[model samples]
Target: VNSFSGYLKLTDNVYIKNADIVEEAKKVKPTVVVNAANVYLKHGGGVAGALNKATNNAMQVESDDYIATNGPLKVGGSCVLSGHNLAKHCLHVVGPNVNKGEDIQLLKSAYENFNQHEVLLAPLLSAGIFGADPIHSLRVCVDTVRTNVYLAVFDKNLYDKLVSSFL
Candidate 1:
């Protein structure tokens, strides 16, 4: 996205993406890609769904392990996968799953759970699943997820056009 347009550079370390998240993953190839996933691997929508598709559903098997162990990943909690078909690793976080805009700190806290990487990639966590605004969620991610963040947007034209219409 053009800087003069709607790309608000949060910081020198933080960047945004306006490409398909799956292809973006293939491009960035981060050491570990984080997603708003639950213990059950019910990430059937948004970036999480794309991650599932990119990783070739290997994480689904990890979800099965959680079921077999009778342990569920807590909110803001995380689990790491082998990143078989994707990055070197994949971090699945149980980001807030509530609608009605409930528990925003939890949404932000989920980001806090992920740090320590030269390269980190994410979307507005829980944006689609929880209906959080992309800008707001991007703020949270930059503020807490890590110093350097790669925020990918699957729909660039859609959002840029919307912002253009308003501005």
Candidate 2:
């Protein structure tokens, strides 16, 4: 029911939906749910917070252990850890802080760097609190990602705007 009329034309299948990401993840049961995470892997707010909470703090515990063992993940770096209650795993990717004048390339790299999952569910990386423009984030995904990615744009207004741009 959340499926849109057409797909983004740049890359392979990158489907957009104006639906709650958690709900969609539940529906799809993807192999991994991409988290727009910070370098420290803290699930404080936004997508990370929501997912960590949904997974019953298993993600937070793993992320804490990961950071304690491995140190901070650099911009555009990734860490894939086991998921608890929802998906099979969690792919935590670090996006650049636009406020720091970080190049958009890092954000693109964040999109480019994740390991393969049979089914991948992702929110718009770097497009929210990190301050990257949503449309630009979509373009990065279109150019870099090859697999079928379900891009859950939770904001209805933004979703309509993005879909309208293509139409």
Candidate 3:
């Protein structure tokens, strides 16, 4: 069944939404947003791609330059990308590349990298989550984060699945 797309307030001031991540992002305007990028910071697919597109490719461009100077960083590696239309800036973290057979172990490693005082918006690592259980991943990811984290969701089916299971 198709689920309605909108923001669902979570514990504290956090929220979850099943809609265009960019639009929801504009509303929440987190202090920093996160995108799952490759070590190369290509911003070419999935959540990372959406974020780069929403910002008119600024994150992609900045990441390209940063990589050129700093060389390839490992997963959980991060950099701050200046922003517009959503938040004060973006926190691009290099998560495991699902395309490369990077499993949940690698994805969990990436999730563990987050330790911050500011609010962070991140992908649920849904694409490469361990156990093939997004619900489990969301719960574990939530616990792993040291700061407030928003799980940016855009798929209606997944959203419906989550809501039906929990709500």
Candidate 4:
């Protein structure tokens, strides 16, 4: 089961919770789940791995198809793929690595690109193996998301850290 630590209400409800984003994506079927994808759109680990595992690797085939057609995604660029299991669609995004140049602008672009979704379900993009600055990524997510948002995390420490920002 998913546990919601807290929420911040601005123009819309931005809920921060302690849960696996993939599971939440399953629970909230039809809500577009944002995958913190690599430039190659590989579903190797982290959010990508779990999502691929959950969908029985069907997602990977689509991802492979995407990369084969469009080449690798640039930082802040995104592509939508058909979802499996309970998810409606997956929005795969390549976030900026902190060590990389243009971290802020790239992250902001990724968040802005998500504006089209009605209920945006995402984790802290690039704050994982991609190594983005957590605060910067969180702020950009909050500022750019125009739709209802659910920010899910798997760790208690991260959930507390992120939810406190809303307080």
RMSD of each: 4.6, 3.1, 4.9, 3.2
Local distance difference test, per candidate?
0.66, 0.78, 0.66, 0.76
Best of the candidates, lDDT: 2
Better of 1 and 4 by lDDT: 4
Assess candidate 1 and give its lDDT: 0.66
C-alpha displacement of 133 in model 3, angstroms?
A: 4.1
C-alpha lDDT of candidate 2 relative to the true structure: 0.78
For TM-score, the strongest prediction is 2
lDDT of 1 at 26: 77
Q: Give a tens-digit lDDT track for model 4, residues 1-167.
A: 23323444434546667788877777667558888887887888888899889989999998898889989988888988887784678888888866555455688788876788877678788787777767667777878777767777777787677667653
TM per candidate: 0.79, 0.88, 0.79, 0.87
User: Which residue runs of candidate 3 sit more than 4 Å off their true CA positions?
Assistant: 1-14, 126-133
Q: Runs in model 2 with CA error above 4 Å?
A: 1-11
Enumerate residue pairs that collide in model 3: none
Residue-level lDDT of model 2, residues 100-163, one tens digit each, is 6777788778887653654577888888778888888887887778777877877989988887
Ranked candidates (lDDT, high to low): 2, 4, 1, 3
Tens-place lDDT digits, model 1, residues 1-167: 32212344556666664667667667656677777786566768777777777667766776677567867777777777666566677777777766744566787778876775556666667676666665666667767755566666778674574344331
